[PDB]
Amino acid sequence: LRRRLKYFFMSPCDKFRAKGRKPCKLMLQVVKILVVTVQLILFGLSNQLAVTFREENTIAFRHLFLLGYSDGADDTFAAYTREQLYQAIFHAVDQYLALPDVSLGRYAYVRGGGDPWTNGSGLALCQRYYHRGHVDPANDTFDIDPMVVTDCIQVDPPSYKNLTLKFHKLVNVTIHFRLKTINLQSLINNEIPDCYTFSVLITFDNKAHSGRIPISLETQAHIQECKHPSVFFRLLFDVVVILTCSLSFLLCARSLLRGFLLQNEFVGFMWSLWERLEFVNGWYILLVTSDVLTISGTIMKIGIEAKNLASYDVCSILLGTSTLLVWVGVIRYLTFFHNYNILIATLRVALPSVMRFCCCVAVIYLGYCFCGWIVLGPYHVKFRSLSMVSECLFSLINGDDMFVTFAAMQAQQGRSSLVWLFSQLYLYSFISLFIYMVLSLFIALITGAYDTIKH
Amino acid sequence: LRRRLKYFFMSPCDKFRAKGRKPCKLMLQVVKILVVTVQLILFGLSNQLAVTFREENTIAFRHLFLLGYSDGADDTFAAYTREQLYQAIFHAVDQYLALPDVSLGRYAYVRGGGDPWTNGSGLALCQRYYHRGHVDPANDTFDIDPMVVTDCIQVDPPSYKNLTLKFHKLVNVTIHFRLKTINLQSLINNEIPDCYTFSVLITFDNKAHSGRIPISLETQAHIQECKHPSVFFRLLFDVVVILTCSLSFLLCARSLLRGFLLQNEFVGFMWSLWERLEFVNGWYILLVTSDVLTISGTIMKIGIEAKNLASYDVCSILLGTSTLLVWVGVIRYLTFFHNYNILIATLRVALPSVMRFCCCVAVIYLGYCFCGWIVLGPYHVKFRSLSMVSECLFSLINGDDMFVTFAAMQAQQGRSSLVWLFSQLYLYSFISLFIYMVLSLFIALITGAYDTIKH
Amino acid sequence: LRRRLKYFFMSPCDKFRAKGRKPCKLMLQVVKILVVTVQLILFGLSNQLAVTFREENTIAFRHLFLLGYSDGADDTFAAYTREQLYQAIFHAVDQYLALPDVSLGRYAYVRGGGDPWTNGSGLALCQRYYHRGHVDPANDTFDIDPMVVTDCIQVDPPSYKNLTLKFHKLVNVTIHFRLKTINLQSLINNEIPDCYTFSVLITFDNKAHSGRIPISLETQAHIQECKHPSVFFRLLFDVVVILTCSLSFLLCARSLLRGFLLQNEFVGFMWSLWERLEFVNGWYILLVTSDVLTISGTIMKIGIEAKNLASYDVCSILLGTSTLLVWVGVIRYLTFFHNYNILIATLRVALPSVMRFCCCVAVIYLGYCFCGWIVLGPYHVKFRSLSMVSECLFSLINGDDMFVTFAAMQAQQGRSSLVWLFSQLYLYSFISLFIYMVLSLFIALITGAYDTIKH
Amino acid sequence: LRRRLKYFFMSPCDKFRAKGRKPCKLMLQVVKILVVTVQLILFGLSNQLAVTFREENTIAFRHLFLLGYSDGADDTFAAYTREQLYQAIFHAVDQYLALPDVSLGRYAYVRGGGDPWTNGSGLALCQRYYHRGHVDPANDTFDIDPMVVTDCIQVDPPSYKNLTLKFHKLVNVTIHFRLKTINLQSLINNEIPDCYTFSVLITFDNKAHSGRIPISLETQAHIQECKHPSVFFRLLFDVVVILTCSLSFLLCARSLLRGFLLQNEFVGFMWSLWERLEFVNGWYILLVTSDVLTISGTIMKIGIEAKNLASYDVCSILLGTSTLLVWVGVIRYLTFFHNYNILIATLRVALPSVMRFCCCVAVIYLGYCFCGWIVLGPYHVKFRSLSMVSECLFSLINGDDMFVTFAAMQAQQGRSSLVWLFSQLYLYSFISLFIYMVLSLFIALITGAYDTIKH
């Protein structure tokens, strides 16, 4: 039994010396790295084509339909007078009606198909306002029924000019229409072009009732297969990836089964559920997970190429994660050699103390996150949302973008002085505490762990 | 006595094992974290509504009243010819008179009400100039009485076109008016809209007499309750927060009282005002302070919701600080376990040596601050004020925004070469000294303190 | 033999004390630093003149030929309507025909000379489209022969106005022409001006068929000697550099030969190919390589000055690399003194363990590179290409540009939420792993190596 | 003798306990910090007034005289057609002639006074071109006499329209004129306004002959006292600063004299010029230097206030440096206490090894500086000059602005691929070597020095 256990933990070279066993798993891992990386790049070609089509069409829509739009102005684009708002609305509708004559793209109109369009209608121009809206700031009074009433005008593709906006109780104005186009660039990748439908929404938003009405354009893209097109290998490579990952999965499962059997034998021969886990190869769990992800991504990729699916983002995430895991998994064979295994050995020693330290640090970090989000968020562009606040604080801990964070508040030093002073205290205390105390101790834990495994 | 003292310092689990005492304080602390954080977010909704209303109205005013204004131009917006200045002034007044017909907001005029407005006047257009102002650069001479004379023209809401500016002795021109509006967006938060009065000040500033007259617009917002409005739970949650914090305050006060009594007994039984303080729980002082802040903020929040107060900024600071303290205070229960208490133990060991080190470092830091502020401030955008200089130097110590700091001075290398050379020496010496000597020693102090408490 | 070996490893001062040997190599090294640095600066003058001529002419071409072009707009410059595209094309051609009357430069036309120009033609205006291009998005159908057909119109320098673009199957439009000019600024450097031919390509690119057609201008510069010009020391300095480097090369080769002979004698007297290499001076290998590079660069520089060559970039790389190596090589004489040799001794001790550590780290780094490039590249401006991804990740490891990297993805939080969440996980995991674990261990290896050689 | 030597090195408290000596120097140092800092701020008021006047007038000149100028465009402002250049030149001259009617400032003309103006002339419009300039790129030939000929047109203040530019051999065009104005804002500081003369130079630069002619405006300001002006304490405070610094200088000189006498006695009683220097107080040398600088700056400040001098920059440098030294000098009294003297003790121990390390590091740093400056400077905005290259490399060592440095070269990846690859190698090697090897060893030296003096 001792000999078999000693053999179980031997390295591939040692196992070869003992039983002449071929290192099939190692060769499979190298081949997997190569083929999985190549597959990811090949998929990236199609993924890029789709993303580019959507984005470029959206930019073209912004230039075509938004009066006086220019690049980079999305965040500030707004109307400020009644005349400006009417001109923007009418320009959008007129450009919609003129699209076949002016656009560099080839678009087809879509009619009907449910709300907000009536049958035969291509464009819906809707204004939403309060049901009852008497507003008299001169007498400091108002009488409001806040139920929202929607009034829509339908425009057929080639009356809307009589639109009368109820400015004082207006909630918003929207323009809805759909356009069909063909992603011809796919021909460059030897793929059949797909048929895209873009749902275009233009919003003139008055929810703040502040005298400033921001204007935005958004699109939703739906991909469908075209009807019997005509155009005057990846399947085999995907099959090869499937077979390599399947063989790897089978071999790793066999190894895990043998490990479980040996663990059972060792426990039985002992005349704690921590020494048993020493028979479990975590690297093989990782390899099995990566094989599962790779095969799922490859099947999804085949489905997309066959035009049964269009979930490019999910497929890209699956294949990218599997590629990273495949590259990482080859470290399993460096664990047998001390000089090459510093990172993993240090991680194993350090992880418990690091997690215990994080227990204390996380409550402080979260307290700062919530305080900053709510107090500074209305005044500071970097504190708008909780995820943004976490990004800002994490970057500050690493010394990044610090003066700019201070300078964003300098405008409030004259306007809201108390908030400015609080922001000073908040930023100085956070940076000092986390860079000089917390991070130093974190690094000290890691380097001490390394010191214990140095020799 | 020994048994009672040993019981006093036992952990919640140990106290339970001894006397079966329930950990009421710990459960209260967890509940407090939850409810205080939720209350802060709920308050943030109303706070954001108010701040957004003010800011958006101000941006709309800039676009409405400043001729040729565009976003991002606030710092450089200026006039350079007499014709430009007259056109800007007249455009502001004309837009004020046209506001009801052109604006997307609904505004009401305000008349009279003291200086600078006469009774019945809505807009005051004032020019301020020297009492006597003979200026003859051709003969290198002047005769000035610098007493400022103000001349104002009053405009009623729906003669100012005859304004004649005394350019050569002009100090500034101001336009003052007030507008009333209603913050309707509060309806989305199930709140009754408030009535806002915006005091608008437009300044054409000639104090430098340099041929460039910067133009700015500023607003002051005053919030009042509207007169008998009509619109076709937070109070209970605030009450719950009050009760949780009150119970926590009472329990912590009881613990502090028992600690004081035990300290008195121990001192008396000894047949220095440093060993006595070992009977004082600093965490309970922190909890009492946080309870006081939370209750004050909650009362202020209730007052604001009832429309008796409008101090959003103070309330936000109170509630945010209390939220951070509540999150931090739960660390008290990790102090009983060495593996989880590294940060606090290191802080306690390190603080004295760190403060002594700061004694020496602070004088150097302040010397650099003053020197940079006065010598480089007129030439360097990052050295304009003392607080800005401290922000710049602190960021430099952390390696942030360094090349940009150097590059701001590169323009003076041809204009003011001596100042450029001095700035080179200043920046290089500061960065070298503080990053490589001071900060290294600071971190060494902290990690040495950690080394002493490692085991 | 022992005495000779002991003498071989003596320092220059010790060798002087032993045999009175003059330190010729050291003086040569100092002289080399001086002359090589001066030569590099003198070459930089001519290199700058050439680069400036090319760049400034290209900017002028962009302003002359691109309708409505402004600085900084290169990345977004595009057409969005048929009318815009036609106007841009015709403006480019009209400006080409008007160049002699409007341009501040003096340009000569080039005719014929092969494709795409016919004989006598100066400008070629070509449109490229699909051979068969029926596109019917209304019926979700198409019939395409993707073979590209090119149709070109030839314009002689002082019919193209009848150009009819096949928009629905258009691949791109190009404008090709060549202009000849003379780089007169070389007179300021006492050089004879060269004759430049600029090949100008203007591309209106429709390969995405997205309704947005980006417009770009690119130039290729060909330098030739002018025909018998008339204009109403560096050769000697280059000769001096050649002689200094040649003498240094000869002395270093002699030293290497003596070292090889001594190694042979020592091995023979021993009644492993690692102890023998201790007789090889790596510094002398470096010096020989630097001499070779310096001489090659100097010969190339002489050829360029004589106008036999025009390879400014290659010459600059040769001379710059040789200058860096010459400056570095003087450290050879600090190796004899422990206090001055910390860097080299630490490097020698640390290199093996560092390379072994890199073996493990590189696979993780590459996995992250590929995953980020393919998954995030279509959405993130910093992940467009593999080299850019490596630049971004390497900068992140050093704490640089981190918040901006996070913020680039914040736009997708509403559009592509799954990709945004993946980007969050990717960035947080990469930064945490590499800054806090990998880099800490790397630095620990280096400082431990230094600890071993401290005394 | 032993007792006297022991007393010599005593601390102020010990000297008080020994002989009851009053700590006059310490009180003087505190008073000096206060008064010198206040004096620096008071001077900063006047310094800011002067700098602001110059800068604002220059910006106004740019807006008045440069056709189509806007803020931030200085680096790219240029002409590209003959018509543009003529319009810019004529606009500048026309605005000069119209200045009294259009400008918001009050300016007086200056006539004559030597070259380039003739007597009675206010504006000089000069074109500079080659003496002989035949340029024929069509035949690849030229005939040039590069002697520069200047032709000037004189304009009196209220023929230049017939200007004919020799475009093909034009070197540049300049416009020179002077304007007199009065810095009235000084009244706000209770100072008499000065009389400024601005020398304005407008350059249309064609030295590159590239078809792009950059346009710039520069000013030189000369300050003079006005002739018998009329306007309808700092001298005493400056006197107080002088007296405090003089008393401090005298006391420090007395201390240095006593130290020298004691050193002589100790050496004589010994029946090396390193033990003798232990009798020299370096802090007192620093204090004497700071007193000298403070007094010089105060005398210069008095001269400027009296209007005998106008050297604001030199005075500001003197006073700022003296302020920093005064703040630093109070550390002398913390040297007597080990806990407060960590920084100085560590510096004293570390300096020799640090300087020896710098000997080796500096040659590598300089090699990189020269190589980068010459090879990358023409392509990279951050490598234009040697000082800029040093700024960039120093910032990179601290991890600052790294991705931007990489990204500046990404444009050459298609244009000049070899230079791009070299830049990749250069940047990666520099950053790796200096951040991970050099800086780590530097910090290790400093922290080891601290370790030696820890106890």
Ligand SMILES: CCCCCCCC(=O)OC[C@H](COP(=O)(O)O[C@@H]1[C@H](O)[C@H](OP(=O)(O)O)[C@@H](O)[C@H](OP(=O)(O)O)[C@H]1O)OC(=O)CCCCCCC
């Ligand atoms: C008796 C059990 C059931 C039958 C098992 C039959 C054999 C089978 O399945 O794989 C054997 C090897 C496995 O290849 P591989 O997994 O690389 O090899 C095993 C591992 O090295 C394992 O160590 P760890 O990796 O550390 O767990 C070791 O304990 C095993 O020795 P042991 O056998 O003495 O226990 C090896 O057989 O693979 C081939 O030799 C070709 C694979 C197919 C190639 C197809 C090409 C078209």
Ligand SMILES: CCCCCCCC(=O)OC[C@H](COP(=O)(O)O[C@@H]1[C@H](O)[C@H](OP(=O)(O)O)[C@@H](O)[C@H](OP(=O)(O)O)[C@H]1O)OC(=O)CCCCCCC
């Ligand atoms: C005799 C003194 C006056 C009368 C005191 C009567 C009791 C009273 O007030 O609180 C008792 C506990 C306190 O709860 P809590 O404060 O969590 O518990 C105490 C702490 O654990 C304290 O340790 P530190 O936290 O380290 O200071 C410990 O010394 C005390 O033991 P001791 O008693 O032997 O000294 C505990 O009683 O709380 C409840 O059991 C429910 C509270 C109300 C819940 C209302 C629900 C609606």
Ligand SMILES: CCCCCCCC(=O)OC[C@H](COP(=O)(O)O[C@@H]1[C@H](O)[C@H](OP(=O)(O)O)[C@@H](O)[C@H](OP(=O)(O)O)[C@H]1O)OC(=O)CCCCCCC
């Ligand atoms: C017998 C072998 C063949 C004949 C060799 C004849 C001599 C010859 O070539 O160079 C001698 C020195 C070399 O100058 P240099 O190379 O500086 O000097 C040698 C090195 O110091 C070497 O040590 P490393 O540098 O550590 O390898 C050392 O072992 C040699 O001693 P050794 O001789 O006992 O072995 C030295 O001669 O150079 C001149 O003295 C002037 C050079 C020309 C100046 C021209 C001015 C216009």
Ligand SMILES: CCCCCCCC(=O)OC[C@H](COP(=O)(O)O[C@@H]1[C@H](O)[C@H](OP(=O)(O)O)[C@@H](O)[C@H](OP(=O)(O)O)[C@H]1O)OC(=O)CCCCCCC
């Ligand atoms: C016999 C030598 C010539 C005559 C010297 C006469 C005395 C004179 O000049 O200063 C004495 C002190 C000096 O003040 P101060 O310099 O602060 O005091 C000296 C220092 O503490 C010195 O130590 P270090 O600072 O470490 O070098 C110490 O050795 C001297 O002791 P010693 O005398 O036993 O050597 C002290 O006298 O200053 C005043 O007591 C008022 C100053 C004027 C205030 C004016 C107010 C309007």
Ligand SMILES: CN(C)S(=O)(=O)c1ccc(S(=O)(=O)Nc2ccccc2N2CCN(c3ccc(Cl)cc3F)CC2)cc1
């Ligand atoms: C940046 N690192 C510390 S570095 O990468 O290790 C390094 C890089 C370059 C050089 S240098 O010698 O070429 N010169 C140099 C060039 C450009 C800017 C600064 C310098 N030095 C100025 C002197 N400074 C110094 C001296 C004594 C002490 Cl007590 C403390 C100090 F900080 C060290 C920096 C050395 C190290």
